[PDB]
Design a protein around this nucleic acid. Structure first.
Ligand SMILES: */O=C1\[N]C([N])=NC2=C1N=[C]N2[C]1O[C]([C]OP([O])(=O)OP([O])(=O)OP([O])([O])=O)[C]([O])[C]1[O]
Ligand SMILES: [Mg+2]
Ligand SMILES: [Mg+2]
Ligand SMILES: [Zn+2]
Ligand SMILES: [Zn+2]
Lengths: 62, 42, 424, 401, 94, 291, 61, 38, 97, 41, 62
RNA sequence: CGAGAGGUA
């Protein structure tokens, strides 16, 4: 997480409820960059760009 | 005596410019270990 | 003209950072067969404020003779026996001689025979007192010594000490009485080390060294260990169930007291008055709204924290009832060696209050269960059912302890609370 | 209605119970993940979609109250990282110590270096002689099927005081155990030099090609790479020559790499760490004849000070020791034995006590020991158990200045 | 000199024997054998420095025998006990 | 005032296992005997090696370390002299009193993996042949080629250093407890509580007698000094039901050898070394007192 | 190295890394996931109160 | 970095001296309180 | 009270508001909580006493025991010129000037 | 059915599904997919 | 990584019990039964025989 | 000679 003046991180240092099952809320690098670096969970996947168009499929549903 | 990489051949080249394996093309060589007596304390 | 370092030379030791003048201590060089490491007495770690886990000490070697002469006259250890910050003693037994002295003064039922007493006398500067126990059984020969007389060989014959708080009476170098408290051994206003320093101030270091050796030998003879019985804090399964139920009821009572204390505001002056109000049931029917009202305010949160601590002191006071005398954690907490009662409570019974002192964008659901995490209207899900909210002061209570395990939501709450702790 | 199909979104798989009854068909089979995704047994849920659906934590809660648990989780221990899910009793320990273990001690451990060191000339390549996998089993480790997640060796660790030599979070080890091959590692350091002057001796251990022969003991003040200048070893450079690698790029710039190896026996100031944030340096080396031996003669390899537990607040290391002792001790039916140590699925304390009782030892993990110096029997039993420890890269001789 | 004899001036009939290159395996048995004698009042040993292989033995006797005499008698008795145990073991094996 | 009279009774005796009972003695004597037999009994082991051909996957130092821990027959350990005190010798090579030379050579010329065990390790003296238990101790594994030629020597050493000259393997001793049963408070306990009391013992020490419907004592030397039955009795309401105290003048030894020397010979050598140390101390004391 | 056969198992990698790095000058380089704000969601800020429409490709905010 | 106040601190305020050593420290209760093991 | 950025002090304004109620407020003990303006209202000695009391309270809350002489010396050293200067470089420069 | 599958069967299925997920994607798949998408498209 | 010889804590020679252990595991035997068949009564030797990982095979292959 | 990232107390 790119934060200007990492000395005063602010709010982006503590675990968030959105970190459930995505990044590890229990293992963070102790030091100046605490909370900025987050290790991903075992069941972590990153979505890629879809090639097919879903407009026709959405219009077909109703 | 120097041993080549993926190719099995002893180069045995001591020239400054000779760094390429003969008939192999790769430029990675490993120094061969000779028969020398060395003592170790168990 | 340069000779190698040998015995008798003085070096100026220091541990970074030098937060006070006692970090500079001049010590005599002693050659040891070891290599690539230095060693010192573990008692001397207090002036340096350093442990043994990778802490490195860098020293300075004077070259001029005058610097050596002034080094051991002002910066030596024997010249820094009085702490300049508070006027008390600087060197004290760190947790080990402390634990051994507490054990040897509290038990009063583990007598030492002649052989063990003579073996322990080799590390004591003074002579042997009378056994004082001639016969303990109708068919028991070999009169034995008591535990409190073993500690009495460390005091000079002309030393008189009195600590009324712990009922400690020392007359003619003999420890006469001692009830409990473990306060005269730790650092304080009337500790025995300070009285010894004010008595002679010539051989206090030798007395401390001899006491450390003797207490280490006695503790090795006895042996101290931590097992699962110390963490269980119960005699059997029924006692554990009773303790769990009592802890649950105490936490519920503390939560009720906190909710009652939260009503001490100007908005409920009509309800708090001695009159006829029909909204008495509505104050207790809305239980989940109290948490949201507390986490959105600062003064209310502080009052709730104070009330919860006041009501949770009694909950913490159950370890002495459900704990045994031989509990290692209890011994180390009473002796003041390492830890406290609250850490034992978190180990065995329950963690207790877990709140953070920073403003966040989420709160705690007051339940810390699976159903609480899935509730859309919980404070953890951004807004507690919408009029919207922008910031929260987290406030949660964990019923489980570190021995029984922690739920993932409980672990998340604990991590959020503990993220605020950092030296750097 | 908000729909997202762009990149950069974090997804995780979850079990859906709406069509979970379709699973029970052709029981013996290994399910491909693609097959399960196509048949709808599993699906990927985004962060925004998860807040709308109800998800159960464990599979036991699903069978209690169904129809309100449309989504379910595979394992709760997968929420943590790869370096944190492998730690046994992770939720039992304090957060600070678990963070230390998952961040620093995992990176600083000495374990499997590589199986092909001939092609790698990396600097400071450390490898342990006898790596050992932990006695306990973790679901994440079982699914990953990799033994490299644990780097270290397990030793019989007793919690007791030893003549005050383990004070201030110090460690006392057994001299006899270390001299047999325990915690013995090797350090391979590589020195590199580039030439665009040529390699040569130009007038003791150097050969005619400008490099020492393999097997030469190199010390300070000696030339490791000769150019004609030559590169000499510094004050703290030593080792035995292992291999010499010569390479060049298309530009014609030749390169030379010389690797020096040395066995790093455990010194008196070496730093060691545990799996629960227990870090300390060695304090004293004691002979095997002076340890508090048990009734069957098993002496503790490592003795730790009891005062660290009440302060550092690390419960679970004792649980790990008890579980390992129960697994290792023989039964006088080894099937259906408790071996898993999943962080969010830890077994109960009663189960551990029963397992240790069925092995013929005390239910609390403590055993009666006898003093090795005088022979007398100690009054209080000492807790002993084979905990898994690690050796850190920080050495005592690397800090001498 | 492996064993050195030092006399204590403060206490009558007191001696301090410093045995070099020794360990607990000898000091403990010597101390336990000295306690069997009726004339021995104080008998103990210590190892102040593990790095310096020395054993210091302090013997106090009454006004009937010298500490050196008691030490020699204890050593002789221990040697005789060892011989008896060796004979018993040899008879038991065969 | 005078010497003691210990008694020795042997229960089981084998080549590498011995279990004998020692009676009428002090704890210090048994502890000293255990320490001497576990740390002071000298044996023969490989300490110096000389490698000239090594193209295996393992390092030379690792091979030397694992070769130095191979047990060897030490029937001549008492008669041999230390290398430090061998005046009429140089120190390296095959010697007559201190060092014995060992030769090893392995070459794999087959497709299958060749395992270099400890059986193909020849020495000049047939009395120092390594102990064979089996396939032998695995040293290294060789692929097609990868020759390994080595020359090593063995010297007499004490088991105190490097923990490789020690022939003992966890030599132990107990106190042989005596179990005391009131035989009067057991009548108050019902048949249900007796089963619970029996199940409280981790080991098989107390048994249930069917004909008399009471508890008995079988195999008393298995209590392990674990406070389990006593705690259960105190919890059930019987504080002085079972009183177990260790006996001070009775011991049960268990000596396990690594195959270098026999257990009985190990005990004899330990006794001889203790006697020699006592004689040296006595000579030093006599020299100090006389002059 | 991708889709290597059985002959490449005995020569090449050590079978301990999945190969998520780069080779620039003999050193391994690893990319770290840079967390950036979403550009396909309406963003509302405070002080001052405003709503912004992010740019997808060209600066048409 | 060596500029302004940092230059003053690194030159005049803080200085490096000779005849110094820095090593790791361990525990040894056998030594006296005023003695250091080198 | 709101910070009066003008030349009028907040204490003087508070004295004017409390004209109808004067006997109820004990003016022999009422003092501003601030340290700097207390020296201008009542004198340097009152400000020094309040500073010593606050320093003792802070030391007690810190959990440490500090002798009275050190605190008195600090208080007297920080008010040599009759004005409590700051710990920055500007205060030291003003004190030296 | 409703609850005829059992409890241990679901635990075994969860373990097998985790194993299959680790076998298909692996520990490092996001970086590989991101780099492959940058070359093909 | 070949088996750690001499049972670092116990002192028993265990270098020749690896092939037998593998053969016993190849049959219908568990770890406990296999260790009991090799006459290992102390849990230290059992841990040494159980915690060892065979790494020399990958060294010979790669 | 500096610069950039990690770590130790
Ligand atoms: O930023 C720092 N500034 C400073 N002056 N000292 C410092 C700083 N950061 C770290 N330190 C030193 O580290 C220790 C912290 O103690 P630690 O972690 O080594 O031991 P414990 O006992 O506190 O914790 P554990 O490991 O659980 O036993 C400080 O003393 C400080 O001097
Ligand atoms: Mg510490
Ligand atoms: Mg520290
Ligand atoms: Zn080639
Ligand atoms: Zn010779």
């Amino acid at each position: 997480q790119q934060v200007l003046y990492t000395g005063k991180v602010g709010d982006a240092r503590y675990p968030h409820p959105s970190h459930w099952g995505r990044v590890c809320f229990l293992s963070t690098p102790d030091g100046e960059n605490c909370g900025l670096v987050k290790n991903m969970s075992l069941l972590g996947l990153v979505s890629t760009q879809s090639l097919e168009s879903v407009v026709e499929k959405l219009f077909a549903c109703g | 005596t120097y041993v080549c990489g993926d190719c099995g051949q002893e180069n045995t080249l001591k020239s400054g410019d000779v760094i390429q394996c003969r008939e192999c093309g790769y430029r990675i060589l490993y120094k061969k270990r000779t028969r020398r007596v060395v003592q170790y304390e168990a | 003209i340069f000779r190698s370092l040998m015995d008798g030379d003085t070096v100026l030791m220091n541990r970074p950072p030098s937060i006070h003048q006692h970090s500079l201590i001049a010590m005599t060089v002693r050659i040891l067969p070891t290599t690539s490491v230095v060693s010192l007495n573990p008692i001397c770690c207090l002036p340096f404020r350093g442990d043994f886990d990778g802490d490195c000490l860098h020293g300075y070697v004077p070259q001029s003779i005058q610097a050596k002469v002034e080094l051991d006259e002002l910066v030596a250890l024997d010249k820094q026996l009085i702490n300049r910050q508070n006027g008390r003693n600087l060197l004290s037994l760190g947790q080990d001689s402390l634990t051994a002295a507490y054990l040897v003064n509290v038990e009063k039922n583990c007598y030492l025979n002649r052989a063990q007493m003579q073996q322990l006398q080799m590390y004591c500067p003074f002579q042997l007192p009378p056994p004082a126990i001639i016969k303990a059984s109708p068919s028991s020969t070999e009169p034995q010594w008591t535990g409190m007389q073993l500690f009495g060989m460390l005091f000079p014959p002309g030393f008189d000490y009195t600590y009324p708080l712990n009922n400690v009476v020392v007359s003619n170098g003999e420890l006469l009485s001692f009830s409990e408290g473990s306060a005269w051994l730790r650092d304080g206003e009337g500790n025995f080390i300070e009285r010894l320093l004010k008595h002679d101030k010539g051989k206090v270091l030798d007395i401390i060294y001899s006491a450390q050796e003797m207490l280490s030998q006695w503790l090795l003879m006895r042996g101290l260990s931590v097992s699962l019985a110390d963490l269980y804090l119960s005699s059997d399964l029924q006692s554990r169930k009773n303790l769990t139920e009592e802890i649950s009821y105490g936490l519920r009572e503390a939560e009720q007291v906190c909710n009652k204390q939260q009503l001490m505001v100007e908005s409920w002056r009509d309800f708090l008055a001695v009159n006829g109000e029909d909204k008495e049931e509505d104050s207790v029917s809305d239980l989940a709204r109290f948490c949201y009202e507390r986490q959105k305010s600062a003064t209310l949160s502080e009052l709730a924290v104070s009330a919860f601590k006041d009501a949770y002191r009694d909950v913490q006071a159950l370890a002495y009832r459900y704990g045994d005398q031989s509990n290692s954690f209890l011994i180390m907490s009473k002796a003041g060696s390492k830890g406290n009662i609250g850490k034992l409570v978190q180990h065995s019974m329950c963690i207790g209050l877990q709140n953070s002192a920073v403003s966040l964008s989420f709160g705690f659901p007051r339940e810390l269960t699976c159903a609480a995490w899935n509730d859309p209207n919980s404070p953890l899900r951004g807004a507690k059912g919408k009029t919207t909210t922008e910031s929260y002061v987290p406030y949660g209570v964990i019923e489980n302890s570190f021995l029984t395990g922690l739920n993932p939501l409980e672990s998340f709450v604990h991590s959020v609370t503990s993220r605020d702790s950092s030296f750097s | 209605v908000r729909i997202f199909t762009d990149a950069g979104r974090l997804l995780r798989p979850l079990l859906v119970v709406e069509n979970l009854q379709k699973l029970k068909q052709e029981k013996p089979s290994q399910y491909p993940f693609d097959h399960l995704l196509d048949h709808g047994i599993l699906e990927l849920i985004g962060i925004e979609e998860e807040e709308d659906c109800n998800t159960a934590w464990g599979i036991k809660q699903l069978l209690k109250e169904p129809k309100i648990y449309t989504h379910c989780e595979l394992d709760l221990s997968f929420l943590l990282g790869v370096s944190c899910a492998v730690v046994p009793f992770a939720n039992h320990d304090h957060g600070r110590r678990v963070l230390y273990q998952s961040q620093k001690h995992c990176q600083q451990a000495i374990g499997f270096s590589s199986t092909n060191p001939n092609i790698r000339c990396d600097t400071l390549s450390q490898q342990l002689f006898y790596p050992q996998k932990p006695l306990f089993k973790t679901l994440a480790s079982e699914c990953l099927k990799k033994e490299v997640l644990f780097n270290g060796q397990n030793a019989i660790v007793a919690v007791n005081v030893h003549l005050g030599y383990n004070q201030e979070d110090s460690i006392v080890m057994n001299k006899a155990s270390l001299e047999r091959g325990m915690f013995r590692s090797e350090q391979i350091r590589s020195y590199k030099a580039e030439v665009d002057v040529q390699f040569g001796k130009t007038h003791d251990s150097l050969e005619d090609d400008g490099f020492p022969f393999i097997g030469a003991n190199m010390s300070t003040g000696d030339i490791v790479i000769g150019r004609c200048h030559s590169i000499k070893l510094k004050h703290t450079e030593r080792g035995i020559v292992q291999k010499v690698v010569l390479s060049s790029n298309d530009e014609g710039k030749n390169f030379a790499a010389v690797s020096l190896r040395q066995v790093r026996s455990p010194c008196l100031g070496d730093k060691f760490s545990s799996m629960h944030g227990q870090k300390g340096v060695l304090g004293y080396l004691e002979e095997q004849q002076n340890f508090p031996f048990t009734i069957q003669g098993i002496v503790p390899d490592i003795v730790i000070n009891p005062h660290a537990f009440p302060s550092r607040q690390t419960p679970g290391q004792l649980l790990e020791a008890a579980l390992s002792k129960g697994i290792a001790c023989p039964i006088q039916a080894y099937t259906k034995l408790t071996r898993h140590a999943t962080p969010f699925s830890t077994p109960g304390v009663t189960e551990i006590t029963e397992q240790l009782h069925r092995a013929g030892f005390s239910r609390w993990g403590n055993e009666r020991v006898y003093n090795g110096r005088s022979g007398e029997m100690m009054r209080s039993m000492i807790f002993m158990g084979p905990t898994f420890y690690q050796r850190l890269v920080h050495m005592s001789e690397d800090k001498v200045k | 000199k492996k064993v050195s004899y030092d006399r204590d001036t403060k206490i009558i009939n007191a001696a301090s024997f410093t045995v070099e290159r020794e360990d607990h395996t000898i000091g403990n048995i010597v101390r336990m054998q000295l306690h069997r004698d009726e004339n021995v009042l104080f008998a103990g040993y210590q190892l102040p420095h593990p790095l310096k292989y020395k054993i210091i033995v302090r013997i106090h006797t009454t006004s009937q025998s010298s500490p050196m005499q008691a030490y020699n008698q204890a050593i002789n008795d221990l040697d005789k006990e060892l011989d008896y145990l060796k004979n018993q073991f040899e008879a038991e094996v065969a | 005032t005078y010497q003691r009279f210990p008694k020795i009774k042997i229960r089981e005796l084998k080549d590498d296992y011995a279990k004998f009972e020692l009676r009428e003695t002090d704890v210090s004597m048994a502890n000293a005997l255990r320490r001497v037999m576990i740390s002071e009994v000298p044996t023969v082991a490989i300490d110096l090696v000389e490698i000239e051909v090594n193209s295996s996957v393992l390092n030379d130092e690792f091979i030397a370390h694992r070769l130095g821990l191979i047990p060897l027959t030490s029937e001549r350990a008492m008669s041999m002299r230390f290398s430090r005190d061998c005046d009429a010798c140089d120190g390296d090579g095959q010697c007559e009193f201190c060092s014995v030379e060992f030769r090893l050579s392995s070459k794999c010329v087959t497709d299958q993996t060749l395992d270099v065990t400890s059986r193909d390790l020849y020495s000049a003296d047939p009395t120092v042949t390594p102990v064979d238990f089996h396939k032998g101790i695995i040293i290294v594994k060789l692929r097609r080629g990868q020759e390994l030629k080595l020359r090593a020597i063995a010297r007499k050493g004490i088991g105190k250093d490097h923990a490789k000259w020690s022939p003992a393997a966890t030599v132990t001793f107990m106190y042989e407890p005596d179990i005391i049963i009131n035989e009067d408070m057991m009548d108050t306990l019902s048949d249900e509580e007796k089963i619970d009391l029996i199940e409280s013992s981790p080991t098989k020490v107390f048994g249930m007698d069917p004909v008399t419907r009471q508890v008995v004592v079988v195999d008393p030397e298995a209590y392990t000094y674990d406070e389990e039955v006593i705690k259960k009795a105190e919890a059930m309401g019987k504080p002085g039901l079972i009183e177990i105290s260790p006996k001070d003048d009775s011991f049960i030894f268990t000596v396990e050898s690594t195959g270098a020397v026999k257990a009985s010979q190990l005990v004899l050598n330990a006794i001889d070394l203790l006697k020699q140390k006592l004689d040296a101390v006595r000579l030093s004391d006599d020299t100090v007192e006389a002059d | 190295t991708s889709e290597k056969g059985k002959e490449n198992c005995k020569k090449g990698d050590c079978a301990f890394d999945q190969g998520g790095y780069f080779v620039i000058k003999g050193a391994e380089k690893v990319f770290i996931a840079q967390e950036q704000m979403c550009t396909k969601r309406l963003w509302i800020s405070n002080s001052p109160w405003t709503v912004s429409f992010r740019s997808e490709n060209k600066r048409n905010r | 970095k060596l500029c302004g106040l940092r230059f003053m601190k690194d030159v005049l305020l803080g200085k490096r001296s000779d005849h110094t050593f820095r090593t790791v420290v361990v525990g040894d209760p056998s030594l006296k309180l005023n003695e250091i093991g080198i | 009270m709101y910070g009066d950025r003008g030349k009028r002090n907040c204490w003087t304004a508070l004295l004017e508001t409390c004209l109808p109620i004067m006997d109820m407020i004990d003016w022999g003990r009422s003092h501003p909580d601030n340290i700097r303006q207390c020296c201008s209202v009542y004198g340097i000695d009152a400000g020094r006493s309040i500073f010593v009391a606050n320093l003792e309270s802070a030391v007690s809350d810190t959990g440490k025991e500090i002798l009275r002489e050190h605190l008195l010396l600090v208080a007297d050293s920080l008010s040599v010129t009759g004005e409590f200067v700051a710990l920055n470089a500007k205060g030291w420069s003003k004190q030296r000037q | 059915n409703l609850s005829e599958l059992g409890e241990g069967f679901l635990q075994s299925f969860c373990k097998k599904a985790a194993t299959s997920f680790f076998d298909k994607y692996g520990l490092i798949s996001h970086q590989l997919n991101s780099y492959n998408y940058f070359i093909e498209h | 990584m070949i088996i750690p010889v001499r049972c670092f804590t116990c002192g028993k020679v265990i270098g020749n019990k690896w092939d037998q252990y593998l053969d016993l595991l190849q049959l219908d035997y568990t770890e406990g039964d296999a260790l009991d068949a090799l006459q290992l009564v102390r849990y230290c030797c059992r841990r040494m025989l159980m915690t060892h990982v065979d790494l020399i095979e990958k060294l010979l292959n790669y």
